[PDB]
Amino acid sequence: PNVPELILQLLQLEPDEDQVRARILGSLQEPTKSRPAAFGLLCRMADQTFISIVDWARRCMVFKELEVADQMTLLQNCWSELLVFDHIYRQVQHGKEGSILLVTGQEVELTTVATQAGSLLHSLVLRAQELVLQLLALQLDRQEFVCLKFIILFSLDLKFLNNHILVKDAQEKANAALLDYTLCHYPHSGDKFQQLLLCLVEVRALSMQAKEYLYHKHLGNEMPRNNLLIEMLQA
Amino acid sequence: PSLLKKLLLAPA
């Protein structure tokens, strides 16, 4: 069966997980100011994840051909959702329900989260793992993941954008590609396209919960200054 | 003034 052209391009724009892991692992060796040292390392890791996500958005087809005011507005709207989705798909590729995989490749056991994390983080992780299980049951592959990511990037009410017809095109074009792909390849357990969209709704709800967790840490004054994610949290 | 912008308008 054929594959939509928009997906095939999104596949070739995807950075391989090894060079992103090395770049992030390499940036975590750079020295910094002390005052927990692992909490500081995890914040920086998440930060570097968001940088390579911006680097991915910069290379995409419709995003590149967009002026800066619109580029910023899109990313400001979808940043945590793109971070959550990146974590989720990592867990899909990491088929181990007893632990979570980090972008650096280190595994953290769920038992470790359950006794060392607060309720908010632990809730947030368990909820995310529930979505991981549903995506594995729906047999999420890489063609849809790339398509999903591109839908998240542009899934914004068109009022807030200036180069508006360019964006409208993208949304329809990405929905049709995901529709066309799931119909030819997954015709067995119901409306895959619809189920995947229902996942988008859950990724949005997870990303708000994630934003609430950052706000909790922020009120605790435990968040390192200059942190990229809390600066995103405030625009 | 902004951070996102900085990242966006970066090398290459």
Side-chain angles (χ1 to χ4, degrees), chain A residues 50-51 54 58 68 71-72 75-76 228 231-232, chain B residues 1-4 7-12:
Chain A
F50 175 56
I51 291 180
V54 173
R58 291 170 71 238
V68 175
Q71 295 198 323
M72 282 197 324
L75 288 186
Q76 293 177 335
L228 255 69
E231 256 194 63
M232 298 297 300
Chain B
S2 147
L3 153 59
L4 198 35
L7 264 64
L8 280 182
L9 296 174

Side-chain angles (χ1 to χ4, degrees), chain A residues 20-32 34 36-66 68-81:
Chain A
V20 316
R21 182 148 50 94
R23 178 215 221 167
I24 295 178
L25 261 176
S27 157
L28 286 147
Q29 323 280 355
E30 292 175 354
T32 194
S34 85
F39 184 77
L41 269 43
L42 287 145
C43 301
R44 294 160 45 183
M45 187 204 69
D47 274 350
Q48 294 304 315
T49 304
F50 175 56
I51 291 180
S52 79
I53 279 163
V54 173
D55 281 336
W56 165 84
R58 291 170 71 238
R59 313 212 313 280
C60 271
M61 52 285 288
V62 178
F63 202 88
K64 67 197 181 165
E65 312 301 15
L66 263 198
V68 175
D70 283 348
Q71 295 198 323
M72 282 197 324
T73 50
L74 278 185
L75 288 186
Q76 293 177 335
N77 183 241
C78 75
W79 65 275
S80 76
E81 315 172 25

